[PDB]
Amino acid sequence: EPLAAGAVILRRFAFNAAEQLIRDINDVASQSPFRQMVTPGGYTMSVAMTNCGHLGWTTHRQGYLYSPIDPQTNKPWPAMPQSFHNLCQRAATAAGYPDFQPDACLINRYAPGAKLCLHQDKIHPDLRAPIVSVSLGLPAIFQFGGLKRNDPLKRLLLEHGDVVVWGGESRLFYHGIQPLKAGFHPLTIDCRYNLTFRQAGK
Template sequence: MLDLFAEEEPWQEPLAPGAVVLRRFARARAGALISAIEAVAAVSPLRQMVTPGGYTMSVAMTNCGEVGWTTDRRGYLYSATDPLTRAPWPPMPAAFSALCHQAAVAAGYPDFQPDACLINRYAPGAKLSLHQDKDEPDLRAPIVSVSLGLPAVFQFGGLKRNDPLQRIMLEHGDVVVWGGPSRLFYHGILPLKAGQHPATGDCRYNLTFRQARKVE
């Protein structure tokens, strides 16, 4: 007899050359990932950073790994030290590293060696404006992005800010990987709609894995 409520298996959804959505890829490991987020945030708290233009970001952020991405009125940078605690960022949890490696392999990037993971927490109304991830010295490495909790609309465009946008609903456990021809495509998140998710309550978490240091 067909079970209409059975959990669907993960599947791949092509997005652009070099880019793919791995649907439900992280769902089975979400509990471990969320516990690891809480452990990281207990050491390096989530905070709303201020951009060089003086804008306070609506998304709360922290990092783990060898380096972390930060922004202030002076610019955008990667740093080995958390400017809030003045201590090194927490090491990348094993659950993060394992999931990222498996997702990168599934997307066709088996050599990806992330050394930074940016953790974003979206409350209702929080968004991420269209931008390129271009602060990394080696743009041959892809980006691996994991969605947990409330659904959000991901915008994925092209190499120019005004290129046509795809709008993709990302749900709990979905992973997006992009690199190669689409590595510098503009992308963002539309304002998060209010809701409740059994795993994260009234928010959404996003893990963004990057290779912030050049690997020879």
């Protein structure tokens, strides 16, 4: 059974690419470090984040923003690694979105206990562009709901190499990650990473 209208899970899709993806996460973060962002209301998120590409997701006192500049370094986010871009395009194509041109990649790092509460990915300049979401490392339980917060959730374990793609009818669906269990993975040791690809600009 597929995930939803316009949505699919490509299990272990990124497994072969994962070692290089992780090397390139480390390179990105060497330039724009992982940081735990603070919400407009003043709470520090448990997931640590950075970005690459032309636009990075950030919080600010005034809201959420896709920005061309990393507010911590005052420099552009690092260029999107070719490994990231190539994996993203292969996964998008396999999922039925062959024309996707991301300009933004949000890199999440989950330590044990870290979560991401149910939310919608908002800001869609192209209603035909999906979200491509790549899991690395330790396993996590992903929630995928509907257009309204109380719509029933599907709960899916996401393991190393899994890729989730949503878009079209499901582009604005609520989703999140449950608190990460401690464990070991040979390539990330003690964390999970996620890559979220978007077209956030015109």
